[PDB]
């Protein structure tokens, strides 16, 4: 379910630490 930064995410609201799913993962929040 919830993931961190470099965790393959679908959207930016699925990572626990409000980040941005840009490079196929959460990174440039």
């Amino acid at each position: 379910g919830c993931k961190l930064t470099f965790w393959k995410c679908k959207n930016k609201k699925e990572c626990c630490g409000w980040n941005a799913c840009a490079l196929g993962i959460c990174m440039p929040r």
Side-chain angles (χ1 to χ4, degrees):
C2 196
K3 313 202 208 92
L4 286 314
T5 336
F6 238 57
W7 287 53
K8 191 81 194 127
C9 46
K10 280 215 257 64
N11 59 305
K12 76 182 265 182
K13 293 203 253 163
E14 70 131 73
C15 300
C16 306
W18 262 319
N19 229 51
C21 200
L23 279 28
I25 348 182
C26 258
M27 263 260 280
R29 68 94 174 90

PDB file of all heavy atoms in Angstrom:
ATOM      1  N   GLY A   1       0.860  -1.221   0.000  1.00  0.00           N
ATOM      2  CA  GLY A   1       0.000   0.000   0.000  1.00  0.00           C
ATOM      3  C   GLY A   1       0.883   1.254   0.000  1.00  0.00           C
ATOM      4  O   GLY A   1       1.557   1.543  -0.969  1.00  0.00           O
ATOM      5  N   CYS A   2       0.883   1.996   1.081  1.00  0.00           N
ATOM      6  CA  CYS A   2       1.721   3.243   1.160  1.00  0.00           C
ATOM      7  C   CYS A   2       3.211   2.915   0.975  1.00  0.00           C
ATOM      8  O   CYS A   2       3.685   1.876   1.407  1.00  0.00           O
ATOM      9  CB  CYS A   2       1.469   3.796   2.570  1.00  0.00           C
ATOM     10  SG  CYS A   2       2.007   5.519   2.659  1.00  0.00           S
ATOM     11  N   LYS A   3       3.955   3.793   0.340  1.00  0.00           N
ATOM     12  CA  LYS A   3       5.418   3.536   0.129  1.00  0.00           C
ATOM     13  C   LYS A   3       6.244   4.786   0.455  1.00  0.00           C
ATOM     14  O   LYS A   3       5.720   5.809   0.851  1.00  0.00           O
ATOM     15  CB  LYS A   3       5.576   3.167  -1.354  1.00  0.00           C
ATOM     16  CG  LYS A   3       4.521   2.128  -1.750  1.00  0.00           C
ATOM     17  CD  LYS A   3       4.979   1.371  -3.002  1.00  0.00           C
ATOM     18  CE  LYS A   3       3.753   0.888  -3.786  1.00  0.00           C
ATOM     19  NZ  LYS A   3       3.467   1.969  -4.769  1.00  0.00           N
ATOM     20  N   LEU A   4       7.537   4.692   0.295  1.00  0.00           N
ATOM     21  CA  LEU A   4       8.432   5.847   0.599  1.00  0.00           C
ATOM     22  C   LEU A   4       8.723   6.659  -0.683  1.00  0.00           C
ATOM     23  O   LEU A   4       7.822   6.959  -1.445  1.00  0.00           O
ATOM     24  CB  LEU A   4       9.713   5.210   1.172  1.00  0.00           C
ATOM     25  CG  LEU A   4       9.471   4.691   2.599  1.00  0.00           C
ATOM     26  CD1 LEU A   4       8.734   5.740   3.427  1.00  0.00           C
ATOM     27  CD2 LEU A   4       8.638   3.409   2.549  1.00  0.00           C
ATOM     28  N   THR A   5       9.960   7.037  -0.911  1.00  0.00           N
ATOM     29  CA  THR A   5      10.311   7.848  -2.118  1.00  0.00           C
ATOM     30  C   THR A   5      10.557   6.949  -3.346  1.00  0.00           C
ATOM     31  O   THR A   5       9.742   6.884  -4.241  1.00  0.00           O
ATOM     32  CB  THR A   5      11.595   8.611  -1.725  1.00  0.00           C
ATOM     33  OG1 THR A   5      11.669   8.739  -0.303  1.00  0.00           O
ATOM     34  CG2 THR A   5      11.583  10.004  -2.359  1.00  0.00           C
ATOM     35  N   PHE A   6      11.674   6.266  -3.403  1.00  0.00           N
ATOM     36  CA  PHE A   6      11.974   5.396  -4.589  1.00  0.00           C
ATOM     37  C   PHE A   6      11.128   4.111  -4.596  1.00  0.00           C
ATOM     38  O   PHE A   6      11.601   3.049  -4.958  1.00  0.00           O
ATOM     39  CB  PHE A   6      13.470   5.068  -4.479  1.00  0.00           C
ATOM     40  CG  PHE A   6      14.178   5.540  -5.725  1.00  0.00           C
ATOM     41  CD1 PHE A   6      14.102   6.891  -6.104  1.00  0.00           C
ATOM     42  CD2 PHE A   6      14.913   4.633  -6.503  1.00  0.00           C
ATOM     43  CE1 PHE A   6      14.755   7.329  -7.259  1.00  0.00           C
ATOM     44  CE2 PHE A   6      15.565   5.073  -7.657  1.00  0.00           C
ATOM     45  CZ  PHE A   6      15.489   6.422  -8.035  1.00  0.00           C
ATOM     46  N   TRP A   7       9.869   4.197  -4.240  1.00  0.00           N
ATOM     47  CA  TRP A   7       8.999   2.997  -4.276  1.00  0.00           C
ATOM     48  C   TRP A   7       8.067   3.133  -5.474  1.00  0.00           C
ATOM     49  O   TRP A   7       7.303   4.076  -5.544  1.00  0.00           O
ATOM     50  CB  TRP A   7       8.207   3.035  -2.975  1.00  0.00           C
ATOM     51  CG  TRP A   7       9.107   2.685  -1.836  1.00  0.00           C
ATOM     52  CD1 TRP A   7      10.287   3.286  -1.567  1.00  0.00           C
ATOM     53  CD2 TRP A   7       8.917   1.678  -0.801  1.00  0.00           C
ATOM     54  NE1 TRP A   7      10.842   2.697  -0.448  1.00  0.00           N
ATOM     55  CE2 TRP A   7      10.032   1.705   0.065  1.00  0.00           C
ATOM     56  CE3 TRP A   7       7.891   0.749  -0.537  1.00  0.00           C
ATOM     57  CZ2 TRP A   7      10.132   0.843   1.158  1.00  0.00           C
ATOM     58  CZ3 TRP A   7       7.987  -0.120   0.563  1.00  0.00           C
ATOM     59  CH2 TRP A   7       9.105  -0.072   1.410  1.00  0.00           C
ATOM     60  N   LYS A   8       8.147   2.229  -6.423  1.00  0.00           N
ATOM     61  CA  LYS A   8       7.286   2.317  -7.640  1.00  0.00           C
ATOM     62  C   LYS A   8       5.879   2.799  -7.273  1.00  0.00           C
ATOM     63  O   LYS A   8       5.066   2.047  -6.752  1.00  0.00           O
ATOM     64  CB  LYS A   8       7.248   0.892  -8.205  1.00  0.00           C
ATOM     65  CG  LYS A   8       6.634   0.909  -9.603  1.00  0.00           C
ATOM     66  CD  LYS A   8       7.691   1.322 -10.631  1.00  0.00           C
ATOM     67  CE  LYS A   8       7.005   1.669 -11.957  1.00  0.00           C
ATOM     68  NZ  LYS A   8       7.502   3.029 -12.310  1.00  0.00           N
ATOM     69  N   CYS A   9       5.598   4.048  -7.515  1.00  0.00           N
ATOM     70  CA  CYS A   9       4.248   4.587  -7.158  1.00  0.00           C
ATOM     71  C   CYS A   9       3.417   4.870  -8.406  1.00  0.00           C
ATOM     72  O   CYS A   9       3.939   5.034  -9.491  1.00  0.00           O
ATOM     73  CB  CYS A   9       4.497   5.891  -6.380  1.00  0.00           C
ATOM     74  SG  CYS A   9       5.746   6.907  -7.216  1.00  0.00           S
ATOM     75  N   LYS A  10       2.122   4.941  -8.248  1.00  0.00           N
ATOM     76  CA  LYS A  10       1.229   5.236  -9.410  1.00  0.00           C
ATOM     77  C   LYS A  10       0.960   6.742  -9.441  1.00  0.00           C
ATOM     78  O   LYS A  10       1.206   7.413 -10.428  1.00  0.00           O
ATOM     79  CB  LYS A  10      -0.072   4.465  -9.135  1.00  0.00           C
ATOM     80  CG  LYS A  10       0.097   2.987  -9.508  1.00  0.00           C
ATOM     81  CD  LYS A  10      -1.221   2.443 -10.085  1.00  0.00           C
ATOM     82  CE  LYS A  10      -1.951   1.601  -9.024  1.00  0.00           C
ATOM     83  NZ  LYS A  10      -2.289   2.549  -7.920  1.00  0.00           N
ATOM     84  N   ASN A  11       0.477   7.268  -8.352  1.00  0.00           N
ATOM     85  CA  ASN A  11       0.198   8.729  -8.261  1.00  0.00           C
ATOM     86  C   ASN A  11       1.078   9.345  -7.167  1.00  0.00           C
ATOM     87  O   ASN A  11       1.824   8.651  -6.504  1.00  0.00           O
ATOM     88  CB  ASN A  11      -1.292   8.841  -7.913  1.00  0.00           C
ATOM     89  CG  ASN A  11      -1.596   8.116  -6.598  1.00  0.00           C
ATOM     90  OD1 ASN A  11      -1.303   6.946  -6.449  1.00  0.00           O
ATOM     91  ND2 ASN A  11      -2.182   8.756  -5.634  1.00  0.00           N
ATOM     92  N   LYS A  12       1.019  10.636  -6.983  1.00  0.00           N
ATOM     93  CA  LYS A  12       1.878  11.280  -5.941  1.00  0.00           C
ATOM     94  C   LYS A  12       1.249  11.181  -4.537  1.00  0.00           C
ATOM     95  O   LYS A  12       1.911  11.424  -3.548  1.00  0.00           O
ATOM     96  CB  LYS A  12       2.013  12.739  -6.389  1.00  0.00           C
ATOM     97  CG  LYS A  12       0.726  13.514  -6.093  1.00  0.00           C
ATOM     98  CD  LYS A  12       0.863  14.952  -6.605  1.00  0.00           C
ATOM     99  CE  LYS A  12       1.335  15.868  -5.466  1.00  0.00           C
ATOM    100  NZ  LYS A  12       1.391  17.237  -6.054  1.00  0.00           N
ATOM    101  N   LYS A  13      -0.013  10.843  -4.430  1.00  0.00           N
ATOM    102  CA  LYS A  13      -0.644  10.753  -3.074  1.00  0.00           C
ATOM    103  C   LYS A  13      -0.561   9.325  -2.495  1.00  0.00           C
ATOM    104  O   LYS A  13      -1.155   9.045  -1.469  1.00  0.00           O
ATOM    105  CB  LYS A  13      -2.110  11.153  -3.284  1.00  0.00           C
ATOM    106  CG  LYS A  13      -2.202  12.633  -3.679  1.00  0.00           C
ATOM    107  CD  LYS A  13      -3.594  13.175  -3.331  1.00  0.00           C
ATOM    108  CE  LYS A  13      -4.407  13.373  -4.619  1.00  0.00           C
ATOM    109  NZ  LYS A  13      -5.828  13.478  -4.180  1.00  0.00           N
ATOM    110  N   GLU A  14       0.157   8.422  -3.125  1.00  0.00           N
ATOM    111  CA  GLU A  14       0.249   7.030  -2.568  1.00  0.00           C
ATOM    112  C   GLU A  14       1.502   6.870  -1.686  1.00  0.00           C
ATOM    113  O   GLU A  14       1.581   5.963  -0.875  1.00  0.00           O
ATOM    114  CB  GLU A  14       0.287   6.092  -3.780  1.00  0.00           C
ATOM    115  CG  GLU A  14       1.614   6.215  -4.525  1.00  0.00           C
ATOM    116  CD  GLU A  14       2.169   4.819  -4.767  1.00  0.00           C
ATOM    117  OE1 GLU A  14       1.629   4.126  -5.615  1.00  0.00           O
ATOM    118  OE2 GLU A  14       3.123   4.456  -4.104  1.00  0.00           O
ATOM    119  N   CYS A  15       2.471   7.746  -1.817  1.00  0.00           N
ATOM    120  CA  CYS A  15       3.691   7.637  -0.958  1.00  0.00           C
ATOM    121  C   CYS A  15       3.378   8.198   0.441  1.00  0.00           C
ATOM    122  O   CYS A  15       2.704   9.200   0.574  1.00  0.00           O
ATOM    123  CB  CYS A  15       4.778   8.475  -1.649  1.00  0.00           C
ATOM    124  SG  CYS A  15       5.107   7.825  -3.311  1.00  0.00           S
ATOM    125  N   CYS A  16       3.853   7.561   1.486  1.00  0.00           N
ATOM    126  CA  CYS A  16       3.565   8.068   2.868  1.00  0.00           C
ATOM    127  C   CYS A  16       4.067   9.503   3.012  1.00  0.00           C
ATOM    128  O   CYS A  16       3.319  10.390   3.366  1.00  0.00           O
ATOM    129  CB  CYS A  16       4.307   7.134   3.827  1.00  0.00           C
ATOM    130  SG  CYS A  16       3.846   5.412   3.491  1.00  0.00           S
ATOM    131  N   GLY A  17       5.318   9.748   2.719  1.00  0.00           N
ATOM    132  CA  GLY A  17       5.848  11.136   2.817  1.00  0.00           C
ATOM    133  C   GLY A  17       5.388  11.895   1.578  1.00  0.00           C
ATOM    134  O   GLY A  17       5.912  11.681   0.505  1.00  0.00           O
ATOM    135  N   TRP A  18       4.398  12.750   1.717  1.00  0.00           N
ATOM    136  CA  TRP A  18       3.859  13.532   0.548  1.00  0.00           C
ATOM    137  C   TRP A  18       4.972  13.901  -0.442  1.00  0.00           C
ATOM    138  O   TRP A  18       5.656  14.901  -0.300  1.00  0.00           O
ATOM    139  CB  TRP A  18       3.245  14.795   1.157  1.00  0.00           C
ATOM    140  CG  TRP A  18       1.758  14.625   1.296  1.00  0.00           C
ATOM    141  CD1 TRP A  18       0.947  14.040   0.381  1.00  0.00           C
ATOM    142  CD2 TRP A  18       0.897  15.034   2.398  1.00  0.00           C
ATOM    143  NE1 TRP A  18      -0.351  14.065   0.857  1.00  0.00           N
ATOM    144  CE2 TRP A  18      -0.434  14.667   2.092  1.00  0.00           C
ATOM    145  CE3 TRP A  18       1.142  15.683   3.626  1.00  0.00           C
ATOM    146  CZ2 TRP A  18      -1.486  14.938   2.969  1.00  0.00           C
ATOM    147  CZ3 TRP A  18       0.086  15.958   4.510  1.00  0.00           C
ATOM    148  CH2 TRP A  18      -1.224  15.584   4.181  1.00  0.00           C
ATOM    149  N   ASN A  19       5.157  13.081  -1.433  1.00  0.00           N
ATOM    150  CA  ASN A  19       6.223  13.330  -2.447  1.00  0.00           C
ATOM    151  C   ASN A  19       5.615  13.382  -3.850  1.00  0.00           C
ATOM    152  O   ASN A  19       4.414  13.470  -4.015  1.00  0.00           O
ATOM    153  CB  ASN A  19       7.159  12.128  -2.311  1.00  0.00           C
ATOM    154  CG  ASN A  19       8.602  12.605  -2.204  1.00  0.00           C
ATOM    155  OD1 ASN A  19       8.919  13.452  -1.395  1.00  0.00           O
ATOM    156  ND2 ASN A  19       9.496  12.093  -2.994  1.00  0.00           N
ATOM    157  N   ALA A  20       6.433  13.324  -4.866  1.00  0.00           N
ATOM    158  CA  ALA A  20       5.898  13.368  -6.257  1.00  0.00           C
ATOM    159  C   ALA A  20       6.309  12.120  -7.044  1.00  0.00           C
ATOM    160  O   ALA A  20       7.483  11.838  -7.200  1.00  0.00           O
ATOM    161  CB  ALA A  20       6.538  14.604  -6.886  1.00  0.00           C
ATOM    162  N   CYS A  21       5.359  11.394  -7.569  1.00  0.00           N
ATOM    163  CA  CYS A  21       5.703  10.190  -8.386  1.00  0.00           C
ATOM    164  C   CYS A  21       6.105  10.683  -9.779  1.00  0.00           C
ATOM    165  O   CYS A  21       5.291  10.749 -10.680  1.00  0.00           O
ATOM    166  CB  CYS A  21       4.415   9.352  -8.431  1.00  0.00           C
ATOM    167  SG  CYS A  21       4.814   7.636  -8.858  1.00  0.00           S
ATOM    168  N   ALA A  22       7.341  11.092  -9.939  1.00  0.00           N
ATOM    169  CA  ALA A  22       7.788  11.656 -11.249  1.00  0.00           C
ATOM    170  C   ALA A  22       8.594  10.654 -12.075  1.00  0.00           C
ATOM    171  O   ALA A  22       8.140  10.182 -13.100  1.00  0.00           O
ATOM    172  CB  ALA A  22       8.658  12.855 -10.860  1.00  0.00           C
ATOM    173  N   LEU A  23       9.790  10.347 -11.661  1.00  0.00           N
ATOM    174  CA  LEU A  23      10.638   9.397 -12.450  1.00  0.00           C
ATOM    175  C   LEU A  23      10.158   7.954 -12.241  1.00  0.00           C
ATOM    176  O   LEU A  23      10.923   7.085 -11.886  1.00  0.00           O
ATOM    177  CB  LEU A  23      12.059   9.584 -11.883  1.00  0.00           C
ATOM    178  CG  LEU A  23      12.750  10.827 -12.487  1.00  0.00           C
ATOM    179  CD1 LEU A  23      11.724  11.885 -12.899  1.00  0.00           C
ATOM    180  CD2 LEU A  23      13.687  11.441 -11.444  1.00  0.00           C
ATOM    181  N   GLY A  24       8.890   7.693 -12.447  1.00  0.00           N
ATOM    182  CA  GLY A  24       8.362   6.310 -12.240  1.00  0.00           C
ATOM    183  C   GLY A  24       8.320   5.977 -10.740  1.00  0.00           C
ATOM    184  O   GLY A  24       7.946   4.878 -10.359  1.00  0.00           O
ATOM    185  N   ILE A  25       8.690   6.914  -9.889  1.00  0.00           N
ATOM    186  CA  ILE A  25       8.672   6.669  -8.410  1.00  0.00           C
ATOM    187  C   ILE A  25       8.497   8.010  -7.682  1.00  0.00           C
ATOM    188  O   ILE A  25       8.410   9.049  -8.311  1.00  0.00           O
ATOM    189  CB  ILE A  25      10.042   6.075  -8.035  1.00  0.00           C
ATOM    190  CG1 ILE A  25      10.845   5.651  -9.269  1.00  0.00           C
ATOM    191  CG2 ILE A  25       9.837   4.860  -7.142  1.00  0.00           C
ATOM    192  CD1 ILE A  25      12.166   5.024  -8.824  1.00  0.00           C
ATOM    193  N   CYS A  26       8.484   8.015  -6.376  1.00  0.00           N
ATOM    194  CA  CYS A  26       8.348   9.318  -5.654  1.00  0.00           C
ATOM    195  C   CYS A  26       9.731   9.942  -5.492  1.00  0.00           C
ATOM    196  O   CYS A  26      10.613   9.332  -4.929  1.00  0.00           O
ATOM    197  CB  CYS A  26       7.745   8.978  -4.284  1.00  0.00           C
ATOM    198  SG  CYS A  26       5.974   9.370  -4.290  1.00  0.00           S
ATOM    199  N   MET A  27       9.941  11.142  -5.978  1.00  0.00           N
ATOM    200  CA  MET A  27      11.297  11.763  -5.829  1.00  0.00           C
ATOM    201  C   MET A  27      11.220  13.303  -5.731  1.00  0.00           C
ATOM    202  O   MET A  27      11.373  13.840  -4.653  1.00  0.00           O
ATOM    203  CB  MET A  27      12.074  11.312  -7.071  1.00  0.00           C
ATOM    204  CG  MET A  27      12.924  10.087  -6.733  1.00  0.00           C
ATOM    205  SD  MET A  27      14.638  10.607  -6.452  1.00  0.00           S
ATOM    206  CE  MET A  27      15.127  10.754  -8.191  1.00  0.00           C
ATOM    207  N   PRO A  28      10.991  13.968  -6.849  1.00  0.00           N
ATOM    208  CA  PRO A  28      10.923  15.457  -6.848  1.00  0.00           C
ATOM    209  C   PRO A  28       9.575  15.924  -6.271  1.00  0.00           C
ATOM    210  O   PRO A  28       8.661  16.276  -6.994  1.00  0.00           O
ATOM    211  CB  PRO A  28      11.026  15.824  -8.323  1.00  0.00           C
ATOM    212  CG  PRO A  28      10.520  14.627  -9.058  1.00  0.00           C
ATOM    213  CD  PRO A  28      10.784  13.418  -8.197  1.00  0.00           C
ATOM    214  N   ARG A  29       9.446  15.907  -4.974  1.00  0.00           N
ATOM    215  CA  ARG A  29       8.162  16.329  -4.327  1.00  0.00           C
ATOM    216  C   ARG A  29       7.787  17.763  -4.731  1.00  0.00           C
ATOM    217  O   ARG A  29       8.673  18.599  -4.841  1.00  0.00           O
ATOM    218  CB  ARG A  29       8.410  16.232  -2.814  1.00  0.00           C
ATOM    219  CG  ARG A  29       9.425  17.298  -2.368  1.00  0.00           C
ATOM    220  CD  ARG A  29       8.668  18.547  -1.886  1.00  0.00           C
ATOM    221  NE  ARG A  29       9.710  19.465  -1.324  1.00  0.00           N
ATOM    222  CZ  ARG A  29      10.318  20.359  -2.079  1.00  0.00           C
ATOM    223  NH1 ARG A  29      10.087  20.424  -3.365  1.00  0.00           N
ATOM    224  NH2 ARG A  29      11.168  21.190  -1.531  1.00  0.00           N
TER     225      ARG A  29
END
